[PDB]
Design an enzyme around this catalytic site. Structure first.
Site, PDB file in Angstrom:
ATOM      1  N   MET A   1     -51.264  -9.528 120.643  1.00 59.49           N
ATOM      2  CA  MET A   1     -50.709 -10.630 121.456  1.00 59.49           C
ATOM      3  C   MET A   1     -51.004 -10.372 122.936  1.00 59.49           C
ATOM      4  O   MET A   1     -50.973 -11.321 123.720  1.00 59.49           O
ATOM      5  CB  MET A   1     -49.203 -10.718 121.223  1.00 59.49           C
TER       6      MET A   1
ATOM      7  N   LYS B   1     -44.892  -2.821 120.735  1.00 55.41           N
ATOM      8  CA  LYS B   1     -45.774  -2.197 121.711  1.00 55.41           C
ATOM      9  C   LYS B   1     -46.063  -0.775 121.246  1.00 55.41           C
ATOM     10  O   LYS B   1     -45.146   0.051 121.157  1.00 55.41           O
ATOM     11  CB  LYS B   1     -45.160  -2.192 123.115  1.00 55.41           C
TER      12      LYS B   1
ATOM     13  N   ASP C   1     -43.327  -2.678 138.903  1.00 52.62           N
ATOM     14  CA  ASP C   1     -44.494  -3.270 138.254  1.00 52.62           C
ATOM     15  C   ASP C   1     -44.312  -4.761 138.065  1.00 52.62           C
ATOM     16  O   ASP C   1     -44.654  -5.301 137.015  1.00 52.62           O
ATOM     17  CB  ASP C   1     -44.781  -2.590 136.909  1.00 52.62           C
TER      18      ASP C   1
ATOM     19  N   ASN D   1     -45.835  -9.497 133.276  1.00 48.79           N
ATOM     20  CA  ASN D   1     -44.625  -8.814 132.812  1.00 48.79           C
ATOM     21  C   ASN D   1     -43.408  -9.735 132.820  1.00 48.79           C
ATOM     22  O   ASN D   1     -42.272  -9.267 132.657  1.00 48.79           O
ATOM     23  CB  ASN D   1     -44.366  -7.543 133.662  1.00 48.79           C
TER      24      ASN D   1
ATOM     25  N   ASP E   1     -41.278  -4.435 130.762  1.00 51.49           N
ATOM     26  CA  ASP E   1     -42.086  -3.276 131.155  1.00 51.49           C
ATOM     27  C   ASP E   1     -41.352  -2.369 132.125  1.00 51.49           C
ATOM     28  O   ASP E   1     -41.546  -2.483 133.327  1.00 51.49           O
ATOM     29  CB  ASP E   1     -43.421  -3.704 131.783  1.00 51.49           C
TER      30      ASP E   1
HETATM   31  C1  LIG Z   1     -47.816 -10.740 125.779  1.00 52.32           C
HETATM   32  N1  LIG Z   1     -47.562 -11.674 124.665  1.00 52.32           N
HETATM   33  C2  LIG Z   1     -46.311 -11.650 124.021  1.00 52.32           C
HETATM   34  C3  LIG Z   1     -45.378 -10.668 124.330  1.00 52.32           C
HETATM   35  C4  LIG Z   1     -44.162 -10.691 123.647  1.00 52.32           C
HETATM   36  C5  LIG Z   1     -43.120  -9.705 123.991  1.00 52.32           C
HETATM   37  C6  LIG Z   1     -41.748  -9.867 123.737  1.00 52.32           C
HETATM   38  C7  LIG Z   1     -41.042  -8.794 124.252  1.00 52.32           C
HETATM   39  C8  LIG Z   1     -41.979  -7.945 124.856  1.00 52.32           C
HETATM   40  C9  LIG Z   1     -41.912  -6.730 125.572  1.00 52.32           C
HETATM   41  C10 LIG Z   1     -43.119  -6.181 126.045  1.00 52.32           C
HETATM   42  C11 LIG Z   1     -43.080  -4.923 126.752  1.00 52.32           C
HETATM   43  N2  LIG Z   1     -43.030  -3.921 127.308  1.00 52.32           N
HETATM   44  C12 LIG Z   1     -44.344  -6.833 125.816  1.00 52.32           C
HETATM   45  N3  LIG Z   1     -44.453  -8.019 125.164  1.00 52.32           N
HETATM   46  N4  LIG Z   1     -43.275  -8.538 124.696  1.00 52.32           N
HETATM   47  N5  LIG Z   1     -43.813 -11.643 122.744  1.00 52.32           N
HETATM   48  C13 LIG Z   1     -44.726 -12.572 122.458  1.00 52.32           C
HETATM   49  C14 LIG Z   1     -45.972 -12.630 123.069  1.00 52.32           C
HETATM   50  C15 LIG Z   1     -46.950 -13.718 122.680  1.00 52.32           C
HETATM   51  O1  LIG Z   1     -48.148 -13.533 122.847  1.00 52.32           O
HETATM   52  N6  LIG Z   1     -46.411 -14.830 122.151  1.00 52.32           N
HETATM   53  C16 LIG Z   1     -47.131 -15.995 121.670  1.00 52.32           C
HETATM   54  C17 LIG Z   1     -47.221 -17.186 122.649  1.00 52.32           C
HETATM   55  F1  LIG Z   1     -47.860 -16.714 123.737  1.00 52.32           F
HETATM   56  C18 LIG Z   1     -47.989 -18.402 122.044  1.00 52.32           C
HETATM   57  C19 LIG Z   1     -47.515 -18.856 120.627  1.00 52.32           C
HETATM   58  C20 LIG Z   1     -48.068 -19.569 123.054  1.00 52.32           C
HETATM   59  O2  LIG Z   1     -49.301 -17.897 121.843  1.00 52.32           O
END
Ligand SMILES: CNc1cc(-c2ccc3cc(C#N)cnn23)ncc1C(=O)NC[C@@H](F)C(C)(C)O
EC number: 2.7.11.1
Length: 293
Positions: free
Chosen positions: A29, A50, A148, A153, A166
């Site tokens: 993701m 992660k 950061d 983030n 983060d």
């Molecule tokens: C970067 N992406 C994501 C990150 C996360 C997520 C949730 C909590 C945390 C904590 C950290 C840390 N340290 C990193 N990430 N994180 N949850 C989803 C996505 C994602 O890609 N959701 C899908 C949509 F974008 C869509 C459908 C439109 O495509």
């Protein structure tokens, strides 16, 4: 409190950490210098997993300390504008952090309309700015410096509630500003003093100022194939009376009035003082943003 997963759950619910992007049939993701974020499912809950990794030059020891910081910070800080850590795995030589999945991903990707998502309205951008500030305010009131702060983030739930993520680089604040030999962050977001190794919450403010310019303009913080290459230099071109913020407003919006945009820009401009001691503290930023709607 938290849950202690072993790999076999995490490995197996991420399709054995399938590093191909979601969009092409994998589970990736996103990714950063410290690891890759994977989509997974635990019980009935979609999660983000992660898995830590030295994607930039850093030590195993440093990765482990960052892992421990994140847990420590998350154990103390629960708030609707922070992500929610469900648990972790330290089992063996691979560290994992498990979060509630964020259905709208990162603010960076939604400002880019990555994967075809619809542009954010001005009304949602205002909600996102207020939320991120509320989250930063909560961290500083608990004496944590994030270090950061950037659009990558800031995550977004199904109602576009902004969630700061983060925390592996976070530091306790107090007396006087401190210095470190290890300079961390993303340069296009960083305050002058942070580039020089000073640790101070004032740097979080400056970085938030850059995020606000991203919100107003939809432009990336840095772009080589652009002039200027750095977003924060837009303030100097508007201050030199060459241009106005209206020349830069994101066009992918139909609900943005000049008055609220200039109000947000004014906040961003205060945050972006090069002199650390001329910037508003986070409480002031929070109130300025509240007064803006
Ligand atoms: C970067 N992406 C994501 C990150 C996360 C997520 C949730 C909590 C945390 C904590 C950290 C840390 N340290 C990193 N990430 N994180 N949850 C989803 C996505 C994602 O890609 N959701 C899908 C949509 F974008 C869509 C459908 C439109 O495509």
């Amino acid at each position: 409190r938290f849950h202690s997963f072993s790999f076999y759950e995490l490995k197996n619910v991420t399709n054995n950490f399938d590093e191909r992007p979601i969009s092409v049939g994998g589970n990736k993701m996103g990714e950063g210098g410290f690891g890759v974020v994977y989509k997974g499912y635990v019980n009935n809950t979609t999660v983000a997993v992660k898995k830590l990794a030295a994607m930039v030059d850093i030590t195993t020891e440093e990765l482990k300390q960052q892992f421990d910081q994140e847990i420590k910070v998350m154990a103390k800080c629960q708030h609707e504008n922070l992500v929610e850590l469900l648990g972790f795995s330290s089992d063996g030589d691979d560290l994992c952090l498990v979060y509630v999945y964020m259905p709208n991903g990162s603010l960076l990707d939604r400002l880019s309309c990555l994967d075809g998502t619809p542009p954010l309205s001005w009304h949602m951008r205002c909600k996102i700015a207020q939320g991120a500030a509320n989250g930063i305010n909560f961290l500083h009131e608990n004496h944590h410096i994030h270090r950061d702060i950037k659009s990558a983030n800031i995550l977004l739930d199904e109602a576009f509630t902004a969630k700061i993520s983060d925390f592996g680089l976070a530091r306790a604040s107090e007396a006087q500003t401190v210095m470190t030999s290890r300079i961390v962050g993303t340069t296009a977001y960083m305050a002058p003093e942070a580039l020089r190794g000073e640790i101070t919450p004032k740097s979080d403010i400056y970085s938030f100022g850059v995020v606000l310019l991203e919100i107003i303009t939809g432009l990336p913080a840095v772009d080589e194939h652009r002039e200027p290459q750095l977003l924060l230099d837009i303030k100097e071109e508007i201050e030199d009376e060459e241009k106005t913020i209206e020349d830069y407003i994101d066009k992918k919006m139909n609900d943005a009035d000049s008055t609220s945009v200039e109000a947000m820009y004014s906040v961003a401009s205060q945050c972006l003082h090069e002199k650390k001691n001329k910037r508003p503290d986070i409480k002031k930023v929070q109130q300025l943003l509240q007064e803006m709607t």
